[PDB]
Every structure is written in C-alpha cells, then in structure tokens.
Amino acid sequence: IETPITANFREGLNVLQYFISTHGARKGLADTALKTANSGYLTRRLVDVA
Amino acid sequence: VYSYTEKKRIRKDFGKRPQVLDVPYLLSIQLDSFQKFIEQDPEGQYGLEAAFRSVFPIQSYSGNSELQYVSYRLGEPVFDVQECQIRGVTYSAPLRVKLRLVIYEREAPEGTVKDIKEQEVYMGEIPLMTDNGTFVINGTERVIVSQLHRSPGVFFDSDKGKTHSSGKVLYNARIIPYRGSWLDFEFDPKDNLFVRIDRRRKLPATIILRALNYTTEQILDLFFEKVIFEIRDNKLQMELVPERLRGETASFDIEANGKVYVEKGRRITARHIRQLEKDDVKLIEVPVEYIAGKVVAKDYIDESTGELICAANMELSLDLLAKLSQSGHKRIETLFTNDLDHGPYISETLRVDPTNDRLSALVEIYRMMRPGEPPTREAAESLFENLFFSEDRYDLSAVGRMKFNRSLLREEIEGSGILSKDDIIDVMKKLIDIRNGKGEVDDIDHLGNRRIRSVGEMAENQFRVGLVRVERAVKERLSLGDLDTLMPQDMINAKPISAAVKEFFGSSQLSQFMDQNNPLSEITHKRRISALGPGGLTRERAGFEVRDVHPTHYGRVCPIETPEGPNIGLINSLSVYAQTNEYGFLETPYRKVTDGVVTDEIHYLSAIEEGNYVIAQANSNLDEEGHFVEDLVTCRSKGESSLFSRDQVDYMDVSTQQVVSVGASLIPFLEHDDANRALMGANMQRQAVPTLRADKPLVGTGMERAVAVDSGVTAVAKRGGVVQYVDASRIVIKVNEDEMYPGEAGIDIYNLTKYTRSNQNTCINQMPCVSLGEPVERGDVLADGPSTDLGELALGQNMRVAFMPWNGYNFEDSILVSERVVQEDRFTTIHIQELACVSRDTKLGPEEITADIPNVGEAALSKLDESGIVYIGAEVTGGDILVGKVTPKGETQLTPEEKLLRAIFGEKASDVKDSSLRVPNGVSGTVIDVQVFTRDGVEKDKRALEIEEMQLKQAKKDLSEELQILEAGLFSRIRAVLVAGGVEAEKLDKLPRDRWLELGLTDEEKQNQLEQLAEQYDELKHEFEKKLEAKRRKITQGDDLAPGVLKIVKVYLAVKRRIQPGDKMAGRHGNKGVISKINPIEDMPYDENGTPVDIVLNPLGVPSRMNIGQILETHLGMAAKGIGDKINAMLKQQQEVAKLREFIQRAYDLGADVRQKVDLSTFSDEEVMRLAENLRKGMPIATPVFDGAKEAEIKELLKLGDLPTSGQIRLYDGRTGEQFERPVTVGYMYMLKLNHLVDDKMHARSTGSYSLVTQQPLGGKAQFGGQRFGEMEVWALEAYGAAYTLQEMLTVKSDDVNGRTKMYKNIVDGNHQMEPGMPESFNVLLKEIRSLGINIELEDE
Amino acid sequence: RVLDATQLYLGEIGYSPLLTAEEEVYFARRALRGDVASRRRMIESNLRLVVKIARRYGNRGLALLDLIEEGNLGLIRAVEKFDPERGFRFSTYATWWIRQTIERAIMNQTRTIRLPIHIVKELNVYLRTARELSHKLDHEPSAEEIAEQLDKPVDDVSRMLRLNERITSVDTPLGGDSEKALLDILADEKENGPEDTTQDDDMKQSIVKWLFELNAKQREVLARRFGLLGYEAATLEDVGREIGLTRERVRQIQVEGLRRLREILQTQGLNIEALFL
Amino acid sequence: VPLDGGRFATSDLNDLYRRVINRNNRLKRLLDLAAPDIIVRNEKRMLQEAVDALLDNGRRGRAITGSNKRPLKSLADMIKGKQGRFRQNLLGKRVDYSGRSVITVGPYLRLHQCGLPKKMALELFKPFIYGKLELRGLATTIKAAKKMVEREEAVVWDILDEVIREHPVLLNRAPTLHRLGIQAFEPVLIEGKAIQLHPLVCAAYNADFDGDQMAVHVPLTLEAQLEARALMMSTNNILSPANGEPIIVPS
DNA sequence: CACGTATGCTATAATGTGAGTCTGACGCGG
DNA sequence: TCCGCGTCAGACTCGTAGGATTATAGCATACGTGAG
RNA sequence: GAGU
C-alpha cells in the first residue's frame, strides 16, 4: 500500500489508518488457512520420494 | 435529560463527537425482509403476491381450462412458540389460497361462459419469524442468514493474461439475469467477437444478430462509421472529416485546394488538424492505391445487368474499383476501421461467420443447445424466442434492468425484464468500446456489483419453485380430466410446496442453529452476510481477491469481523449504520455539507453514489454550529484519501463507529489494538458463556445498552407507567393514562422466561430489574436477560489483574487465578442439558417405560417413581437411571453360562432387556424438569396424568388472575368516569361491583365511555371461557410423533460447572489463555492495602501480540474502580448527600473535551443514593471506538481516585511477604469464560466399540473414540526408530481384530507381547480391487 | 458430438415410420398371424407413444431411459394382445399397457427394500386420502384421522406409513461438508468390545476350574443338563438318558451342585458383587 | 443395517448393483422375446452405462446422482480419493489406548515428566490394572476388577500408581510437522482434567497454552516401552534433527 | 385351504426429449 | 505447437440437523409354499 | 457452524 500507517498502537490508529491495516491483516490470516495446504503438500511429496 | 433506568446508573462518556444519528434497530434486516414476504400488498410484487401473479394464471395445454389466483390468507399459528419448542414442531401458519377454475368452450371461440369454480385450498404451512428474528423449526430456534451475490445486470470483465502466453487481454461481457440463461460475449486472440449462450460452445457474435434479423449491411451500419469515396473525372476523391486521420501517419501527400498540408510519411499533429478543419476541407484527392484494403459498406450492383459487382463487407481492389466506375457508380460507401480507436472487429467476425440468413443463424444456435436433433423453423424460432425474449423464462428483475440501464449510460431506470434487440447491440457496442480503449471494466468485488438477498427474497424463491412444480401437475390434470365434475382442489397438491419451503427452512445451509451462547452471539449471527451456499461462491471457487477488504466496504461491511478459517472473507458481519437500499445494495449514512456548513441532513449513499462525492472523515473538526475549523480537511473520494479545501467537501461520515460492526464496537480501546487480535477478540466475545452473576463491564463503549435492548433477550416496557406487581416469574405494569388506550384494560403483563435450555445447552434466565411500585417510561428495561446488567450487555466479569510472571504458571498465555474467584462463584456457569428417552415399537413388540427393570439395584430404583421417571429435584451422577426402559428380546437363546446364571438368581425378569436412559458418564446434575410426549390412543402414565393436573390447574389460575386484575382495573376506571358527572364515592363502593351493569348516568360522552367499559368487561368474560377451552384442549392433546415411536420422556438436567484448570478464558482484545492453576488467597500478590489480585497474566503476551487495548483497559479499569472505592468509602460512612453530589459531579465532568454533560443537581436525593450505591462497585466508563479516552484523561481520572498515574503499584508476594523489585501494572480487565470447558474436552479410551467396515475404533468423544493416528504422526515414528510402536498403532490398536483381543488378554496376563496379524482394512481393500475385476493375489514364500 | 445414450435413442426413434388407421389394421392382422416385420414395424412406429408417457412419468423412481425401456415392454404385450377386429384405435389400448408396466416396475425397483404391490396399493389409497384431508384440514393428516376416513384399523395404517419410511445413505457424509460419513459413526453392534469378550473368557475359564472343585456326580449332572461339558442342552427330565435316569434325584442333585457353587462365589468375592451384572 | 429409528441405511454400491442386475435381466428378457434391434441396442447401452457407473462413476461423463443429488459412491471411489482406503484407513488409523485434553504448564516437572490427569490415566491403563489386581488376588476375576474401577475404590488408586511407575506415554500435538511432534515422557498422576507439559519441550511441539490440546498414547509392549524410553524420550531428543542447534531450550 | 405373492387385462384418441455456470497449476495428447 | 482434458488441492479435532422428498388403479385368475 |  502506497500510504503507510504513520501512527502506532500506543497512539491509536484513526479510522482510515485502521481500515488500511485490515488488508494486510486479513491477507495474513487467509494465507495461514490456504497456503499451509501447499506447504504441507510439499512435505508430503518430499516424504513419499524419500 | 436521562431515562429512569439511566438515573439508576450512568456511564461516563469520554466521547467528544456529538452523535447526530443514533444506532438503528440492529435486527432491522431480518424483520423488514420477512415482513415484506408475508406482507399483503395489492400492487407491490413482494413475496407471495409476486409469486402467485408470476406463475398464475396457469392455462391448460388444450386451452379449454385455466386456474387463476384471487388472494391468500395465513391461518393463525396452531401452536404458539412455547408449545412448538416443547413439542418439537415448526411454528408456522397454514396458507389458504382462493383460486378460480375457469373453463372455455372449444366450440365457441373463447367463450368463458361455461364453468367458474372458486374455492380456498390449503398449500402448506409457512414457518413464521419470531418478534426477535428467529424461526422455530422442529422445536429448535434457528436463524436464516442473508446472502451476498453478483447483481443481475451486465458485467464487463477481462482475463488479465491467463490464456495465451501471448499475454493478450481478452475482454468479455456477461449479461446476468435474475432468472434465465446467461448471455456471454467474448473476444478471441484474433480479435473475433464470439457469443456463448449459457456458457456452451463458442459461436461467432454476428450469428446472434442474424437470428434477430439483421442483414450484413445493417450490422456494419450499426458498428461502423462510413467513409464516402467520390470518383471525379479520372482522379480519386474522398470526403474528409478533419479529425479522423488524427494520430495517424500520412501514407500519401495530402493536398487541399492546390496546397500541400501533410508531408507524405509524417505524423499529423493537432496543428494540421485545426488548419484542415478551419479551411473547411470536404474533398481530398487520393491515389487509387489507397483503396486496396478499404471495406465496401453496401451491396453495389451493375444497373445494366442487375448482378452484384461486390457484396457488402468485401475488401476492395483496384479492379473492383475499375468495374464499379465503368458500371456508373461515382460514390462508394466504405467502412472506417483505423486499428487503435476504431477496430474492424465485427467486419472480421462476419468473415468467420459460416451462416448467411436469419434462418441459417437460428438453426446454428438451435444446433448448439440441442446438438443432433434436426432443425425445424418453428422449433428454432421458438427456442431462440424462449431463451432471452420470453416473459416466463427470462426476468432481469427491476434491479437487473436498473443496473443494466445504468451500465449502458441510459436515462431510464425501469423497463422490460426481457432483453430487447437494442439491449444486446448496446452491450456489444460497449464491449468493443472497452477493447478500443474508451471505457473501462467493472469490478466484481466492488459492492456496487455485490447485492444482498436477506430472508424474504429467499423464502419467495423457494415458494416460486413449489408453485412451478405444482403448475406442471395442475396443467397436466386440467387437460386430461373432464372439466365439470373436477374441482380445483383435486388437482392441487400441498406436499410439493410444503416440501420446497421445509427444505429451505430446515435443510438449507443458510438456516442454522441460532448461536445462543450470549446476546451478542445472537445479534451478530442475525446480521451475518454469507457469499456461500446456493447461487453463490464455493470454498473451492473462492480466490484471494474476493476475500480481502474492498474500499467500498467502508461504512457497509466490517473489515475486522470474518471467521479465521476456510470461510475467511466469504462470511461478513454487517457494519453498524449500514442498511439495504430498495434494490438490495448496501448503503451508509452521511451528513450533507452545504456551502461548507455541515448540516444535520442525512443521506444514505450506495456503493456507486459514494464514489462520486468527496466525503470528509468523521474525526474532521467542525467549528461550533457551522463549517470545518481547519482549511484543508482530510477526506476521501474516488476510493482514495487525502487533503481537500472546504469548498470541495460534499459530505462527512455520520459516526466514527460506522466503519466497524456490532461485535467490534464493544471493544474499548480498539484504536490501540492490532486488527488481527481485534478480530479474534470480537470472535471470542461471541463464545462468552453468561456467568451466574451477570456483571457489567467497567470499561465499556456505549454500544452495551443498544445491544442488550435490540437483542430482544431483555423484556422492555412498551407502555410504561407504574409497576403494580413484581414477581420472580412475571411483571405487571399499570399503564399511564396518556399512552393507555380507552378501549381495552390498561394493564401490561410481561411473563418472564425462567431457567430454560439454550441451543448450546447454556442457561437462559430472565430476572426482574425494577422494584415493586417503580415508575417507568416506554423503552425502559423491565427484566434483564442472561448476560445483561441493568440494561447494559454483560458478557463476563471484570477482575483485579496484575501483569507479571509467576513461577511459570503463566507460561505461554497460561492464566493464574485466585481461589477467591471460585469462592465468589464468579465464572461459575449454568448448563441445562436436555436428554430424551424414546419408547419405540419394534418387530418383537413395544418397549416399556416401567420402573420394573431386570437386574437393577434398589439404590437405582429408589430415584425412579411409580411410572419409572426420576423425581423433580433429584441429584444424579453418571450411570444413575433417569427413565427406565426395557425392550422385548425375542428368541433369547442363551449361552449355557447365562442359562446357569439366570437359573441361580432365578431373576428371569422374563424376555425383556434393559435400554434405560441413564446419565452420561462423568456428567452430574440436578433434575430441574421432566416432559412426557405420548401418542393419542395409548393409555397415559400415572406421572403424565399428574403433570397434566398441574398444567390444567395452573392454566386455570393464570387465566383467572388475568380476568380478575383486568376486571378490577376496568371497574377502577368506570368508578372514575361515574365520579366525573355523578358524585357517589362511598355510595358506589358499598354495593357489590358484580351488580354494576345497572349503573349509568346522563346521555353524554361519559355514558358512551361506560358502554365501552361494559362491552369490554363481557368480551373479556367470554374470551376467558374460549381461552380456557383452548388451554384444556392443548393439555389433553396427544402428540403425533415419528412412526415407530409410542412416547418420549425429556429430562432436563441443571449442571453447575465451576471454573477449573483447562478452562479457556479470554479478554476482548483477542487475548486468550488456559487456566493453569488456582492459587490459594495467601499466595497471591497483594497490595500495600492487603488486597489480593484475582488474576495474574503474563506481560510477555502483550508487546508481541500488539493488543495494547488490554493495558489501557486495565489502567482505566483501575481508575474506574478507584472512584468506586471512594464512593464505597463515603457510603459506608453515610456522610452528606451534598458531599457525594460534589465528588460525583466533579467526576462525571472530568474529561478535557467531554461531549456528555451531566448537570448532576436535578437528581433528587433518593435518585442520587440509588446511583451511588450502583457506582460503588466501580464507576462504569464508556470509551467509544475511535473516539475513546486519551492517556491524559485516564491519568487525570486516576488522580481523582488517588491512584498512581503510572497505573503501576507496589505488590508483595503472598508467599514470602517480600516486595516485588519493581512496580507492577494492576487494574481491572473485563474477562470472559468461553464455551471451551475442559470438562467437555477431556477424553480417554483404552478399548471400545469398533467401526463397521474398517473395524478401526470410532472417532469423537460422543462415540467413545480413539485419537486418529494420522500419516503425519506415523512419519514421526518412521523418523525415530520406533517400529514396534508403529506396528502396534497400525494393528492391535486399530483393525487387527484377533490381535487386539489376544493382546488385551496378554496385558491382563502381564505378558506385554504383541502377536501381530493382518489389518482388516487391507482384506477389504483386496475385495474392493477384485470387485473392479483386477486379480490381486498374495504370493506365498 | 452426440455421446448421450438418451439423445442417441431418441434420434433413432424419430427416424421411424408413423402409422395410420388402415396401416395399423393391415400390419395388426399380419402381426397376430405371426409376421416378423409387422411386429417390428408396429413396435418401432409406436415407440414415440412410450416416450410421451415415459417423459410424463419421470421424477418418481427410475430415470427417463429406465421408464422408456419398461414402457417398451408394455408396447410389446400391447402388440401381442391387440384386437384389430374391434373398430377402436391401437393408441387407446396401448396407453393402458404402457402405463401398467411402467407403474408396476416403478412400484418394485424404486424401493431398496422391495415392497409388495398389495401393500403399495393400500399405501396409495392412504396417501390420496391424506391429500383430501390436507386440503380441508389446514394441518396434515394424523394416522388416526386417515384410519377414521377409510374405516380401517389405526395399527394397520401405522404399519403401512412405517413401510413408506425411505432409506438413508450410509456412505453420504452428513455434517453439511463431506466431513464424517454415517458409516464411521455407526459401530458393529453384533460385535462385543474386547472388554466384554475378555469377561466371557474369564467366566468360561473359571467354569472349567469350578467343574473340578465340586463333587464328581455334581459337575457331571449339572454340566450335561445346561450343555456346558456335554453336547446338547438337556432338561431335568432329559438328564435321565445318560445314567441318572431319575426325575426327583436329578432335580435334588442339580440344585445341590448350584448351592455349593453359590458359596464358592460368596467366598471368592462375587455373589452380590457380580449380581448387578 | 438398521438404524435405532427402525429405518435402514445401506451402501450406494447396493443401488449400483441393483441398476446393473435390473438392466442385465431386462436384456435377457428382450433377447428371449426376440425384440427389434433398436430396443436391444438401447438396453446394451444402458447395461454398459450401469457397469461403468458401478466401477467408476463420473469418469464416463455425467455421474449417476442418487437421493440428495450427490453422485453415488462407486467401487473405485472407495479406493481412489485421499479419502479412499489408502490414505484414510491404511497409512494412518484411529488407535486404542489414546486420549486427549487441554495442555497447561508444569514448571515443577523435570524435562522427562508430564502431568497426566488421574481419570484419564485410570482409563488408558485399564488392562494393566486388571492384571496387577489379579496377581495381588485383590480381584477374583476381570468383571469384579472392572466393578472395583467403576467404584473407583481407594486401593485401585494405589495399584494404578504402581503400574504407571517407569511406564512412558507418548504426547502428540497437531500438526506433527517433524519427529519431535511426538515425544515420550514418564507420567505423573495429577488431580484435575488438564495435561501438564514441561515448558522446555513446548518449542518442539510449537505448544502455547491458549487452549491447545494433546493426544496421549500408551506404548503397550515391552519393545514399544523401550523404543519410547530410548529413542523417543524428551531427554534423548534434545538436538533438532534438522540442524545441529537444539530445540529444547528455555524461552 | 388359506395366505402371500404374481402375472393379467382395461379399447374415444393421444405417437419428438430437455441444469447451473467462475478455481488454478501442471503434464500429456490430438 | 495450439489447446482441450484430467489430475491434484495439508493434518487432526469436536457440534449438529434434517428425515425429508415423491407419486402410483383396481380386480380376477395364476403360481407356490406353509400350517393345521 | 466452530477447533489448532
């Protein structure tokens, strides 16, 4: 994102900085649910081969 | 100006931004939507009216007979919600519909003068929504969740690469109706326009125009701009339009008049263009060579022969030009196609098009959908017309037509549901415009293109399906039967419609058990939006783009509330102020800014409307009753945010809260919390189990009260007035004359729901808030629901918390709790569990519910009474029998041992088994209630009969007290009317009230009032009779159960669960923990004052977590309690009302720029001491979301409590007595006990039952299951050495049948030897491969 | 790319001749006399009729093709038992046969547990009655309400509606997603847990030791009656076949063996301990 | 099989076998009847469709939908998928003498120990109790031993304490990414329902006590006990098998 | 002989069908 | 080489619920086994 | 629907 969050958690984000934070946060969480699968699928391909 | 229930306890507000609009009804969506479905509208096609007019009138295939719809009516519900929940039936109203069978003569042309038969037929019961927003389906409370789908209309999208490593952007249009086949247009790498009907095989786009009767020349005139070529004398000339060239390179020397403008081989800039245009250039001489390649527009023929020299859309040559000249044509219309802006797409698509005329095109379309089947002309016209041009099979809907027309830049919103020939061409035009470079692609994730379908739309659709199934049956029977004997009801079946609707409200994915852990869980569940289920996305289909936060989500959807799971991003909580537009798009309130001054005029803007205006931020500073303080205001438009001047500003955010959803709004210092942690915080608040004592939150936001009231779990006063009678069961209020209607008796009765089972087997208990003889207004809380304090929402319990390590007892989020928490029964929770015992009828014979049970101790039978049912109040533990049941065991061929054993004790107890319902193992509770459902013909149990005696007499008492309080209240009014113009005070009281039918006065308005009160008295007199007969009938009524089932006994256990190691606890900043140890009071860190801390949480689970909200909550919580401790001290010493008033006013009016004013004074002394008594257990404070308390305000509040500004205190170790070496942060964190109790998690198994085919042990604690030893877990043993441990796990522990028993015997024999075998799964695998016809043999050594 | 079994077959039927009245008469007379071609042409020409009724008989049990084939069986019997001497048309007579064979097949094949036509026909009347009740009673028919209308036994109505209960798939995963199939919930019931099987082992082993703990003439009479040591479980009177040959002395000695064994269970530590069991 | 409700429940293979038999027998009939060839052909197509559905449904085009609309599970489907029989019932399984519960800290423990709830351990070591009970002659037989455990008699606790002595138990956490996701410990009987885990091994399990749970498994044979104590013991698996640096370290 | 189950015949003429779509990455075959 | 088709899609946990959905003619002789 |  081109606009960074200037504030910190002690300061408190404003509505716009918090809404902008959301994107990164949720992509992180979705990444753990969905990508774990490809990581894990690689473990399993490796194990079968060796 | 504060309400009565707020006078009892006021929350201090640190908010500074005045709320111009209050939080709306939160369960608006469910109620409005379903209300539209059942709502009787003559015109406005909504729910049923629409459904009937859409399908009906249904006319026969012969055309003699037709069935037409008149009107419908819902019968009143057979059973109330209560009886439905107990009995396990759907709460529904019978649907009775008036229908008219009209018949035509075949001999007369269309003579309707034969037979008109009109009757009211039953078509199903429709489930009704409760006033709360729920449906009771088979005695279970369920909520149907709104859906989010792609809006009907048009969408222009584009594969951004994907296909062809060429990397070509292929543009496409998709026309999506509400009902019908999809119409796709798409480009090919070679720039040929294609049509996919119903995403079938590809066809050239021009073919569809031929089907709509377009000649070749007409098609070209539609997409292409024409160019005129005049052939004068011998030189070639063409009619020039000054711009057309524009950004082209001049291929010839362009000479105008006599003078050369362009140089040959140079690019024509803006100067050349304006020079040519101003000179008025209309002819330019050109070389003959330039036309080689130009496309002719029309058919040009030789006027002499009358044969076609060149067909339309044909590439010209030097020789065709020559032939054209000599024939006698000195004007040639050619197509304009200059790459770049004007592409020849349709020109090239016509050359790919194999079809010629209309018929040839219709045949090819027909052959695509129905490949093989020979064409007929009638068939191809019928099919094509029935695709997109039939009113019955195609319907864009109002929203489809509206979004369609706006996408094609029309003026008119409303129009036909069927596609016009002009529609299709306009869509193709826009597609091609987008390919050229003028015009843009629509965004699918944009909320302007995602529409909301709540309940009523969805009930409507299922109901239409039911009608369609019926239409086939009806039309079929109208044609076959004689018309005159046959009435309409023998043709209609109710079972199809009932089945369609039953499947929606019961089988559907969106119909789910209400999440009833707590009020917030319920309210948030009912405002859920799901992109999943039918007509939506799938988890497989769902990408990464849809899931992420879209810019338009601002003010409409919560960015921070979504399941952390596979459903991440598909399920969305609605924002606070968000609402559905008439078409079903989401919209958000905004304050209109006029001439720089910010009005209170409020406009709800849709996703698409929002893009157009510049909207200032809510935090933007307004200047005292006019414009913005600051010159450059921070605003957002075109979906992006920056500084603007004041004159540019159009609008502003209504509240700072409108971005956030309900659940996240309840998080105090959200502003200081990481969005991830905050998400799980809002998610865990829904998991909070209500404790025995519902404790308010010290650090709140203000949404607390809104949520408790709107949830419906609280009893709220409609009429108000003074409370006549409180009871732990009921509240009767006497209404005030100003709201009290003069017709019916003005006494409201709210019956409170006592200790009832939830869907999650939590406890639902309503307690009375108000005292006897308390004055109340409309919208005051009369009784608290389960997790609500005086009107506010109370999900858990606030506690003295200290952040510091203990001896590893708070290692990784592990929680150290004081024994005092357990003693005070805080986080003690009530679980009401419902166990059923079913008496079925088997092939051998009916099962008996006698106390007479073979082989049972007197200890066990002590607790069962005559019928075989446990007593009310009886404490029970695992293995105790609750309802005794025995099953007929026919052909009981015993093993010789059993013959001997049954001979020894002589306890033959006959041919009967033991199938008794007994308490599940390890669960232990008190029986609170028992219910018996019997069939109608079967003779009642003695216990069932005494239950009905109680219900009958209790019913009689209830109704009797109704008529008595209503008659007393009614004559109390007649007494006041009679005094009006007839003083008889003492004289009227002496004669009996029963002989007051004679009493009147002179004929005025007051005599008419006496008549109203007398007609009501008698109305109530008969009403009481028919009510009592209804009650008596329902109590005697025998219930229709499942086939096979003779009777059912439901036992309700009340379990008190204590907090204990393993139990899961969390805060509201997503901060979880499992309790590790309960520390003795002596051991816990204590203050200088000697007061021990309740909970010891680990410091190290904060800076990494980046939820700083919990620390601010703790500092403010201590400050809140600081002031509560001062008020507690002043109340203990009585002191002066004047002095308390002083301190409390200085306290409420502390904050730097506090919005909330509290001019204490007006409070009467009695109101002030009731208020202080509530403020004593800590002054409750509200920190709005994004407009919360500042650090400096919290430190200022701490100084008012004489607590430290650091909010760190000196602590002493309970064990040693020595001080901790540095100050520790202590304060009050509001904590929640989640549903995840170790009591219902801990599971262990040695040996148990085994699976049917695979012979492996079952899964799950309910089935007494072994833990699954998965591939992952196997590999671990493989990495190690552990070969015997692995084989064990594969063989004697799972399948190996012989092996497991043999090794069990060895382990009791103490041999610890395996003796392995063959896992039964493998034997099956072999059989399954041989079933495929593959010989798979074991080859021996 | 015509791959579909159905569309291929319907293509083949369309490619047939349509028969007239005089043509039906000529072929029908030849057909009954036993013409090969006449039978084939009458069948092939009237396949369209099967389909028209077969298309209006779907979504009830079998598939369109399935109903089309069984319907064709009706056509064959129709051609076999057609009377061309009667002036009345073939289409009219065939319709009966096609509907008969389709319905009969739909009543048998559809239901996994095969239900007899006798019960199915009774069921029909119960359900038709339920429909008329439902139209007037806004609620649904009770078993007793249906029984009242047909003047029949409540128990008989209940047995019938129980047989209506259609079968649940074991292999189908239930929890909305394909999570756990019903198979893996449902345990092998006939099969005892190893705990229960081992308990029987302990009892059976103790008995052998208990037979060599009493009297020689007390374990011989007691064991061979119950069929513990012997081959057949005899009665007090039947123990006379061996050597006992008594009725009173067998009954005194049977109970004498059990009385001394009751004290052997009171001393080892069972009796009332193993009475609950 | 009959469900409790009186209803029956069956495999979809039964529906596919019934398809095949009906059409095959109808083909026998139409051959006995000398049917015209168009109809014979239709029946032969339908027969091949039914067998192909029975072997592998969905490969030959549109799979045959049963009752819900879901395609019938065919023979090949029971072998093939991850869910088939290979991955589900054969390369990993459900296991006896297995339990689970929430984990919580045991900072008092030494590295080779773990807190095992009393009631959990009672159940997992049931055969081992039965065995010692009969060798002490406290239990006359197995059913009496079972009833003594059911009654949870005071002498039974003393016997259970004696069995668990020097007997290793496997703790497992999902997901098991590497071998240290299973470790053996000597159990310590504890009052309460939560498993107590040694902090230093929390690293290998990636165990944080905010509600995580663990599987417990009992190595039965002498060989399995020895492989647990020697190879899989916490103390003996200090270094990561991935890199030289150890995993079991304070944090 | 009754009971349970099955194969039989009915005669106005009627004779052509009919869900859900959009995942994405890779590796061969036509 | 351009492009339709088929093959995968991480591991364990618990909780559910619905049984729901549906229609079919009626009656006489024939075929076959079981009970008294 | 939730659990990691």
Ligand SMILES: Nc1ccn([C@@H]2O[C@H](COP(=O)(O)OP(=O)(O)OP(=O)(O)O)[C@@H](O)[C@H]2O)c(=O)n1
């Ligand atoms: N969907 C999930 C969630 C969690 N886990 C496992 O559970 C662990 C803990 O998950 P979580 O509690 O969400 O993360 P922590 O790192 O403990 O952070 P916190 O609890 O503070 O949020 C992860 O490391 C992972 O091994 C998983 O496999 N799949």
Ligand SMILES: [Mg+2]
């Ligand atoms: Mg965790």
